[PDB]
Design an enzyme around this catalytic site. Structure first.
Site, mmCIF file in Angstrom:
data_model
loop_
_atom_site.group_PDB
_atom_site.id
_atom_site.type_symbol
_atom_site.label_atom_id
_atom_site.label_comp_id
_atom_site.label_asym_id
_atom_site.label_seq_id
_atom_site.Cartn_x
_atom_site.Cartn_y
_atom_site.Cartn_z
ATOM 1 N N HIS B 41 -45.629 100.508 7.852
ATOM 2 C CA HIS B 41 -45.738 100.047 9.320
ATOM 3 C C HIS B 41 -46.233 98.462 9.601
ATOM 4 C CE1 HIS B 41 -50.155 101.349 7.891
ATOM 5 N NE2 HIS B 41 -50.274 100.015 8.267
ATOM 6 N N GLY B 143 -56.435 95.210 8.392
ATOM 7 C CA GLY B 143 -55.976 94.366 7.373
ATOM 8 C C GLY B 143 -55.871 95.011 5.921
ATOM 9 N N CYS B 145 -54.669 97.774 4.850
ATOM 10 C CA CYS B 145 -53.322 98.326 4.547
ATOM 11 C C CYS B 145 -52.448 97.701 3.319
ATOM 12 C CB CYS B 145 -52.585 98.628 5.583
ATOM 13 S SG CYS B 145 -53.161 100.038 6.533
HETATM 14 C C1 LIG Z 1 -54.134 99.080 7.882
HETATM 15 N N1 LIG Z 1 -54.379 97.985 7.783
HETATM 16 C C2 LIG Z 1 -54.991 99.969 8.782
HETATM 17 C C3 LIG Z 1 -56.142 100.519 8.095
HETATM 18 C C4 LIG Z 1 -57.119 101.228 9.136
HETATM 19 C C5 LIG Z 1 -57.899 100.030 10.180
HETATM 20 C C6 LIG Z 1 -59.193 100.373 10.176
HETATM 21 N N2 LIG Z 1 -59.571 101.413 9.072
HETATM 22 C C7 LIG Z 1 -58.278 101.822 8.346
HETATM 23 O O1 LIG Z 1 -58.091 102.482 7.245
HETATM 24 N N3 LIG Z 1 -54.005 101.232 9.295
HETATM 25 C C8 LIG Z 1 -53.597 101.384 10.463
HETATM 26 O O2 LIG Z 1 -54.299 100.640 11.607
HETATM 27 C C9 LIG Z 1 -52.825 102.581 10.805
HETATM 28 C C10 LIG Z 1 -51.537 102.136 11.090
HETATM 29 C C11 LIG Z 1 -51.006 102.952 12.362
HETATM 30 C C12 LIG Z 1 -50.204 104.175 11.561
HETATM 31 F F1 LIG Z 1 -50.803 104.855 10.617
HETATM 32 F F2 LIG Z 1 -49.100 103.682 11.142
HETATM 33 F F3 LIG Z 1 -49.930 105.200 12.448
HETATM 34 C C13 LIG Z 1 -52.401 103.593 12.774
HETATM 35 N N4 LIG Z 1 -53.137 103.120 12.202
HETATM 36 C C14 LIG Z 1 -54.439 103.796 11.818
HETATM 37 O O3 LIG Z 1 -55.079 103.884 10.790
HETATM 38 C C15 LIG Z 1 -55.101 104.433 12.962
HETATM 39 N N5 LIG Z 1 -55.329 105.964 12.766
HETATM 40 C C16 LIG Z 1 -54.463 106.841 13.147
HETATM 41 O O4 LIG Z 1 -53.517 106.956 13.899
HETATM 42 O O5 LIG Z 1 -54.554 108.105 12.093
HETATM 43 C C17 LIG Z 1 -53.788 109.224 12.730
HETATM 44 C C18 LIG Z 1 -56.212 103.943 13.643
HETATM 45 C C19 LIG Z 1 -57.517 103.910 12.685
HETATM 46 C C20 LIG Z 1 -56.689 104.873 14.736
HETATM 47 C C21 LIG Z 1 -55.797 102.393 14.322
#
Ligand SMILES: *C(=N)[C@H](C[C@@H]1CCNC1=O)NC(=O)[C@@H]1C[C@@H](C(F)(F)F)CN1C(=O)[C@@H](NC(=O)OC)C(C)(C)C
Ligand SMILES: *C(=N)[C@H](C[C@@H]1CCNC1=O)NC(=O)[C@@H]1C[C@@H](C(F)(F)F)CN1C(=O)[C@@H](NC(=O)OC)C(C)(C)C
Lengths: 305, 300
Positions: B41, B143, B145
Site C-alpha cells: 500500500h 507512518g 507501516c
Molecule cells: C500504516 N502506516 C498505517 C497504520 C495505521 C495508521 C493509524 N494506525 C495504524 O495502524 N496503515 C494504514 O493507514 C492502512 C493503509 C490502508 C489499507 F490498509 F491499505 F487499506 C488503510 N489503512 C488503515 O489502517 C485504515 N484502516 C482500515 O481501513 O482498516 C480496514 C485506517 C486506520 C482507517 C486509516
C-alpha cells in the site's frame, strides 16, 4: 491508535554489555570507552555478602582476578578502582561500539528501559518507573547484576541505573552509574526495609489522558477540583500529593485533549472513591502509574531515536 | 524474582530498518541482503486505498518512484516485484548488518516482539500475542507501516509479522514476510470485522505457573480436575478448549513447580466461576493470556 508499555530500542546498549567474572561470581559489566562498570559485590563470596568490608576485599584482588569477556574475545584488565558501590575496571581496548552517553541520576516517578542480561548476553528489555520509595519492580534472576537502566534522546544514551539486589517484597534495588544507591539500601545481605510505597499521581493523570486520546471516555465527568481539595482525597488512597509543577508538566496533554488538569483530577477523585465497577481503562482493571507525561506524549507523536 | 512483559533485544532488527517513500507516502521497509520488504500500500494515494487495483497501480510505477534510505545513505532500487500484499524492492547493495534470519508464519496464541518504527527509525519495542482471531493489540500511528514482529533464538531472527493496518475496534492487522495476511483481512480501506475473540487457555495456565514461581499462591486450592470437566467450564467463559498437546507443552513448568496441570486447571476453574473478587495475581486484576509457556520458562 493503541497504548502499550514500550521500551527504548536496546541496540546501542547491547553493544556495551560484557561478562565480568571474579571467583565463582559472574555478573554483567557496562563497557564504555576503556572502562567496564560493574557492581562491587562481584568481589564477594556467598559468605562475604553477609557483612563485607569492601575496601579490605578489594585490596586482596589484582587485575588477573577479573575475567572480562566481550562476546568470544577476552578483554584485558589493566587497572581497577572502587567508586561508591561500583567497580571500574580499566581495560586495554576502548569499546568501538561506545555510543554518545551520559550518566544521569533519575528522580522518583521517572521511567527507564532495563536491558536484562545474563553472562554478558542481553536477554530481554522492559520499562520500569523508579518508585517513590526508590525501588523498581523488575524481573531479575541470579547473574542479572550489572544490567543497566537507560533512556535515549535520539543519539545520546542516558544511563541511570545498574542492578545490584532484590529486597523482601520481590522488589529491586540498585545504583546510578557513579555507584550511589537509589534509596536507603546497602550492598550487604542483611534484612532491609523499603519504605511504604505511594502511587505516582502525575503518572496516573498522564495515563488517563492517554485513555481519552485512545477513545476510552467513560470516566470523564463535569466536575473540577482544587489542587488542595484533591490532595485530601489523594492522601486517603496513598497517592503522592499533586503540585503546580505536576499540573504544568501535564499541560501539553491537557492542551491536546481540551480537558483541564483539575477536571481530570476530579475524574480521578471519583475513580478512587467509587472504584472502576468492573469496567476497564486501556485494557487494565487497575489505575496505572508507570507512564510519565513524556511516555504518553512520545506514544501520541511517534518520537524516534 | 519478578515477572514482566518483556520484549527481545532489538539491535539485530534495528540494523535492518530503512525508510521507503513512493510519491507522498513514506513508511518503513525491512532491508535483508539486497532486498527491501515493505507493505504494498506504499504505492497508493489516499484515494486509491478505498478500492485499490494493486496490479494496475504497480504497473504505473518504475524503480525511480521508490526512494529507499538507510540513515543518510540512498539505496538505488534496481528491481521491484509484488508477492501477495508485500513489495520486494531489489537494491544495489547488500545490507552488511543482515543478521542470520528466517521468515515464519506464527500460530495464533504465539507471541513476538514489535519494533515500532517511523521514517525508517526505531521508536520502541513491545511484546504482542497473535490473537485466535488473528489481530494484535499494538501501538501503531501514521507512518508505522512496515514495522516488524520477530522472535530471536540465540543468533537467528525469525521475522513473523509486518504491520499493514488498524481495524474498527482499535486492533491491528498485518502479514507474514511473504505478504499473506493473518486472518481474513485485505489491504483496502473498507470496514472489516475481526471475529469474536477467545482467551488463550494454555497461556493463562503458563501465567498461573509464573505466579506460583514468584510467590503469588493464594489461588492454589487442594482440588484437582479432569480435562473434560475443565473444558465444560472453559467453554462457558469463552476460553479455547485445552488439549493433551497443551497439557504436554505445560510439562516443563509443571515439573519445575511440582504442580500437576490438572491441579492448576482446578485453581483456574474456581478463578473463572467465583471471579477474582478484587484480588490480584502478579499485579494484575484480570487473568492474563499473552504469555506463552516458553515466554514463562525464559523468565524462570
Ligand atoms: C500504516 N502506516 C498505517 C497504520 C495505521 C495508521 C493509524 N494506525 C495504524 O495502524 N496503515 C494504514 O493507514 C492502512 C493503509 C490502508 C489499507 F490498509 F491499505 F487499506 C488503510 N489503512 C488503515 O489502517 C485504515 N484502516 C482500515 O481501513 O482498516 C480496514 C485506517 C486506520 C482507517 C486509516
Ligand atoms: C545480582 N546478580 C543478584 C541479583 C539478585 C539475584 C536474585 N534476585 C536478584 O535480583 N544480586 C545479589 O544476589 C545481591 C548481592 C548481595 C548484596 F546485595 F550485595 F548484598 C545480596 N544479593 C541479593 O540480591 C540478596 N538481597 C539482599 O540481601 O537484599 C537485602 C538476595 C536476593 C537475598 C540474594
Amino acid at each position: 491508535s493503541g497504548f502499550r508499555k514500550m521500551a527504548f530500542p536496546s541496540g546501542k546498549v547491547e553493544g556495551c554489555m560484557v561478562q565480568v567474572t571474579c571467583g565463582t561470581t559472574t555478573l554483567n559489566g557496562l563497557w564504555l570507552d576503556d572502562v567496564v562498570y560493574c557492581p562491587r559485590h562481584v568481589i564477594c563470596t556467598s559468605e562475604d555478602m553477609l557483612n563485607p568490608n569492601y575496601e579490605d576485599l578489594l585490596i586482596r584482588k589484582s587485575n588477573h582476578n577479573f575475567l572480562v569477556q566481550a562476546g568470544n574475545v577476552q578483554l584485558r584488565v589493566i587497572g581497577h578502582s572502587m567508586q561508591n558501590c561500583v567497580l571500574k575496571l580499566k581495560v586495554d581496548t576502548a569499546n568501538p561500539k561506545t555510543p554518545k552517553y551520559k550518566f544521569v541520576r533519575i528522580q522518583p516517578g521517572q521511567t527507564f528501559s532495563v536491558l536484562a542480561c545474563y553472562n554478558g548476553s542481553p536477554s530481554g528489555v522492559y520499562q520500569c518507573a523508579m518508585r517513590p520509595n526508590f525501588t523498581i519492580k523488575g524481573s531479575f534472576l541470579n547473574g542479572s547484576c550489572g544490567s543497566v537502566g537507560f533512556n535515549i534522546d535520539y543519539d545520546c544514551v542516558s544511563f541511570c541505573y545498574m542492578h545490584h539486589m532484590e529486597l523482601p517484597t520481590g522488589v529491586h534495588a540498585g545504583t546510578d552509574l557513579e555507584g550511589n544507591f537509589y534509596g536507603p539500601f546497602v550492598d550487604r545481605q542483611t534484612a532491609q526495609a523499603a519504605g511504604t510505597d505511594t502511587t505516582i499521581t502525575v503518572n496516573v493523570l498522564a495515563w488517563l489522558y492517554a485513555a481519552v486520546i485512545n477513545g476510552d471516555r467513560w470516566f470523564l465527568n463535569r466536575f473540577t477540583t482544587t489542587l488542595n481539595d484533591f490532595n485530601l482525597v489523594a492522601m486517603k488512597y496513598n497517592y503522592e500529593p499533586l503540585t503546580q509543577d505536576h499540573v504544568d508538566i501535564l499541560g501539553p496533554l491537557s492542551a491536546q485533549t481540551g480537558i483541564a488538569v483539575l477536571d481530570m483530577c476530579a475524574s480521578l477523585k471519583e475513580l478512587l472513591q467509587n472504584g472502576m465497577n468492573g469496567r476497564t481503562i486501556l485494557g487494565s482493571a487497575l489505575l496505572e502509574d508507570e507512564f510519565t507525561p513524556f511516555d504518553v506524549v512520545r506514544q501520541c507523536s511517534g518520537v524516534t531515536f
